C-alpha cells in the first residue's frame, strides 16, 4: 500500500514524514522512485563561459591543453560546458582567474535565458548573492546599461563583489537591501529578475539538511515572503518602456505551494500583469489544478525542471509581462 511505501522511503532515504508525503504526492510512483534516486546523486559540474572575455570553443580548446575533459551542455545553450574529469583544479586555472568562466549550476542558466536583457536597459536582480545570474545579465547586455544587484546580507555580498571584478562586469551597483524595500527606494526598472528564497527541495544533493528540517511551519513562512517578493517585482517594473518591461520569477523548489500558488497570487492581486511564454527549449508545463486548488489557465506556459528528466536541479521559471 502507499502508506507502506511512504514509510519505506522515509526510512531508506532519511526523509521526514511531512516532506516525503509532499514529494510522493506530486509524482506518480514510478516517477517518484526516479526522483529520489536522482536526489542522492550529485549533479554534473558545469561552467559558464564569459562572453565579455572569450567564447566557448577557445575556452574549451584552452582547457583541453591543461587536462580537462569537456562537452557542451546540449543545444539549448551556446555558452555552457560540462566537466567530466580534470587534473588542474577549476578554480585555480589561469583562464578562471582572468575571468573567462565561472563555476555555476545548469539550473541557474535558465532564468537569465528566459528573460531577454537587451542593450541600454536598467535591470534589477533581487537576490544576486553568488553572482552567476548578474554576470550573465551583463554578458547579454555587453557591459551596457545599469544592473542593480542587491543582497540582504553583507557576508554573501563580498563574494558577489569579487565575481563582478573577476569577470570584468563594470555596469553594476551592489547594494544591501531587503527586496521589499526596493520599489519604494528606486523603482522604474525595465527588467527585474527574482530568484526568491525557498525550501531548496530542488537542490537535495547540494543541501542534505533540508531533507529533515522542513516542517509545516516552514511552508507557511516561505511562500508568504515570496508573495510579497513577487509583488515588489511588479511595482519595480514599469508598464510602458521602449523595450519590453518583463519580469522573471524563479525558484529552486519543487513543492507546488512555493512556485505555482505564488504566481497565481500575483495574477489575482495585480490584473495588469500577464503570463507569457518563457522561451526555454525543454521543460514541463506548470500544473493547472493540483488538489482542489484551481489556478489561472495561463499557468501552462510556466515550465518545471527535474533532476531525473535531465541532469538539472529542480527548478521553476515564470516570465511576466506588465501592461498598466
Amino acid at each position: 500500500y502507499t502508506n507502506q511505501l511512504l514509510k519505506d522511503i522515509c526510512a531508506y532515504y532519511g526523509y521526514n514524514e511531512y516532506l516525503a508525503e509532499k514529494l510522493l504526492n506530486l509524482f506518480p510512483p514510478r516517477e517518484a522512485f526516479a526522483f529520489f534516486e536522482a536526489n542522492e546523486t550529485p549533479r554534473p559540474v558545469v561552467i559558464r563561459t564569459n562572453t565579455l572575455r572569450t567564447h566557448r570553443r577557445d575556452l574549451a580548446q584552452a582547457l583541453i591543453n591543461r587536462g580537462v575533459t569537456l562537452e557542451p551542455v546540449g543545444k539549448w545553450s551556446k555558452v555552457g560546458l560540462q566537466v567530466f574529469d580534470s587534473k588542474v583544479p577549476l578554480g585555480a586555472t589561469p583562464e578562471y582567474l582572468a575571468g573567462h568562466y565561472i563555476l555555476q549550476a545548469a539550473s541557474s542558466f535558465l532564468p537569465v535565458m528566459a528573460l531577454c536583457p537587451q542593450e541600454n536597459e536598467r535591470c534589477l536582480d533581487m537576490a544576486a548573492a553568488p553572482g552567476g545570474k548578474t554576470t550573465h545579465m551583463a554578458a547579454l547586455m555587453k557591459n551596457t546599461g545599469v544592473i542593480f544587484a542587491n543582497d540582504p546580507s553583507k557576508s554573501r555580498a563580498k563574494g558577489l563583489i569579487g565575481n563582478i571584478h573577476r569577470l570584468g562586469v563594470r555596469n553594476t551597483i551592489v547594494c544591501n537591501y531587503d527586496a521589499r524595500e526596493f520599489p519604494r527606494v528606486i523603482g522604474g526598472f525595465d527588467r527585474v529578475l527574482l530568484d526568491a528564497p525557498c525550501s531548496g527541495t530542488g537542490v537535495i544533493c547540494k543541501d542534505p539538511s533540508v531533507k529533515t528540517n522542513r516542517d509545516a511551519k516552514d511552508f507557511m513562512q516561505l511562500p508568504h515572503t515570496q508573495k510579497q517578493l513577487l509583488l515588489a517585482a511588479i511595482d519595480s517594473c514599469n508598464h510602458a518602456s521602449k523595450t519590453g518591461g518583463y519580469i522573471v520569477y524563479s525558484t529552486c523548489s519543487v513543492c507546488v505551494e512555493e512556485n505555482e500558488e505564488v504566481v497565481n497570487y500575483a495574477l489575482s492581486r495585480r490584473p495588469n500583469v500577464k503570463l507569457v511564454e518563457t522561451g526555454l527549449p525543454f521543460g514541463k508545463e506548470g500544473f493547472t489544478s493540483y488538489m482542489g486548488k484551481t489556478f489561472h489557465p495561463s499557468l501552462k506556459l510556466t515550465r518545471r525542471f527535474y533532476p531525473h528528466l535531465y541532469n538539472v536541479d529542480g527548478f521553476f521559471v515564470a516570465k511576466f509581462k506588465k501592461i498598466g
Partner: protein
C-alpha cells in the same frame, strides 16, 4: 581599426583606388594573420562592448566587436580586378 575602415573606404572609391586598397589589406593578412583573423569570423566576435564607427580615437572604436561584410558587396563590384582582389584576399583568410 584600419582594416574595417579601409574596407569601408574601398566601397565608395574609384576602381583603381579600390583595387589598390584590397591589395594593401591582402598584405596585412599575409603578414599578421592571427591578429586580424577574428574580424571575418563572426563567432569569435567580442562582446565587451559595441562598435563605434564615428570615433575620435583609434583605441576607442572597439574594432573587435564588429564583423566585416564588405566582401559581399565587392564580389559584385563591376571591376573584376576588385573581384579578383577579394578572391585573393579570402584565399589567405582560409590559409591561416
Amino acid at each position: 581599426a584600419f582594416c574595417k575602415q579601409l574596407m569601408t573606404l574601398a566601397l565608395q572609391v574609384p576602381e583603381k583606388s579600390s583595387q589598390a586598397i584590397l591589395g594593401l589589406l591582402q598584405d596585412v593578412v599575409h603578414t599578421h594573420g592571427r591578429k586580424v583573423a577574428a574580424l571575418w569570423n563572426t563567432e569569435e566576435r567580442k562582446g565587451d562592448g559595441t562598435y563605434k564607427p564615428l570615433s575620435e580615437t583609434v583605441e576607442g572604436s572597439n574594432p573587435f566587436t564588429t564583423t566585416i561584410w564588405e566582401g559581399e558587396l565587392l564580389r559584385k563590384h563591376y571591376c573584376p580586378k576588385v573581384r579578383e582582389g577579394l578572391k585573393a584576399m579570402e584565399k589567405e583568410l582560409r590559409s591561416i
